[PDB]
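Quick entry between incubations.
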Amino acid sequence: HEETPPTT
Amino acid sequence: TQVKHMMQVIEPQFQRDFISLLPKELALYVLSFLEPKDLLQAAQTCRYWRILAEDNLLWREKCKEEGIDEPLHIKPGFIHSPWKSAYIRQHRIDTNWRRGELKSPKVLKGHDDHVITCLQFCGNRIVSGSDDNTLKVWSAVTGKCLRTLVGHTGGVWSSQMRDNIIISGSTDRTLKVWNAETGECIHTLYGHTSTVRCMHLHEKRVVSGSRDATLRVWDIETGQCLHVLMGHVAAVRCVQYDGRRVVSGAYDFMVKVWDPETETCLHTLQGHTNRVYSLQFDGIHVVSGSLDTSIRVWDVETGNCIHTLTGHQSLTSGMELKDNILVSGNADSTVKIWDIKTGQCLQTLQGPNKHQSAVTCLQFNKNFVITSSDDGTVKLWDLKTGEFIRNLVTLESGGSGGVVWRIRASNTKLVCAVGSRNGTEETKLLVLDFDVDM
Amino acid sequence: PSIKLQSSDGEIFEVDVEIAKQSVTIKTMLEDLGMDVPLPNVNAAILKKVIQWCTHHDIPVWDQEFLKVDQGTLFELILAANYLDIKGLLDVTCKTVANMIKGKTPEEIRKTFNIKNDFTEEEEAQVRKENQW
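Done. Structure below.
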């Protein structure tokens, strides 16, 4: 799938 | 009188034709019932007709017709019509995109081994945002990096640009106002308890959506935080701000409409059976696109769903709305054009030369749809017929990791953010130039 | 109710006040000036045709048969419509002429209008370079 910020 | 002038100074031969013998005004009145493609042919019959078909006010009208609002200027003899050169220039530009030889683009290497998470294009300035913690300001004319905006500690994921003001959002839960000219952070905006994911900049105010389920309205000038919108369960994915209402889309399947001044939630739009990821708003209609493969069109004044548009088969990632025409890009490899008034799906952009993976981005205008994709291509489409025109970009690495993240288009250039999760494609921007010499 | 107008030819026509006021010229002469309508720029032949159109009143079928005539009659109908101020006739007639140019090849329009290509060798090239499609 696509890009998204890394989960914190 | 530009035509009277012409007649006596060129003194054309005697003619035996209806329009040469008609009073000059009634001739123009007859010439006006023609389409520009005809006027252009008529101008090549004889010198008298060429002079008549350069009546400025006949072309000021053909431009107003085609949404050309400014005359073009340059630096025996001829008195050229600026409206006419303005009109031709545009038809040439259009032809250039459509079938013009693709001049090799300016390669803007930067953000090595990272993603370009957000892209802006204003006049001659490009701004790339990245998970490398930095943003970069470039010239579309030279291809040179002019400023590298260093200051963020977490990665940049959102962006906004007006004129020499840049806003940025990051995993460091801060926003940042910048001087695009001097690459100087002027304000660091604190208040978000999670990643700053989306933002929308209306005039002197930006609204930010965050992974903390809140939005914050900020003053670009002062740096204050005018309001905080609280009511969202899940993270806030997309935001729109027209200056009068804030519309937000959250992973909690909900679209929320706010009056910011009162910090009040005016409407919670219910329907999406999965995370809403994309949003458009025109002061009248909210359009939301979900990981539930539907797109919903709501009345902002009543909260009433007006249409639920179906047919996409996966996540509607990016959407663009413009005079009640909507274009949606999706992971199903398909792009759709819709009439948000009637609900009809005008066109589905697929076919033998369709995208092979998900659509990552799109732009459109009254003639064209520009689409980008993980298949490493950027395609040009006939908006009116839905037909494929041509591939403007074809990464050699498209099938093995090359990807086009994002595109911005102007009337004369296309800017592409390109890269790869695996080293097949050095990350970079491509700048294509469709201007015509005149 | 019926009024009298006299062509440049000298022939006076009987026309109903209402069919004649479709021309602003005749209307201004009748009401504001009070005349037996002298029309010095229209002959009886063209006046008869303009009244035929007016009595019958984007290109209507009747108008396309009425204007199916020689180029000379069309030229005089455009001038009489301008002189009489009949926006209807003027448009229908001017549109009928533009339509003879729509299918357009510079040479094909020349052949249809009896035009002579007065452009020099170089001039013609620059003109096509300029109106390039």
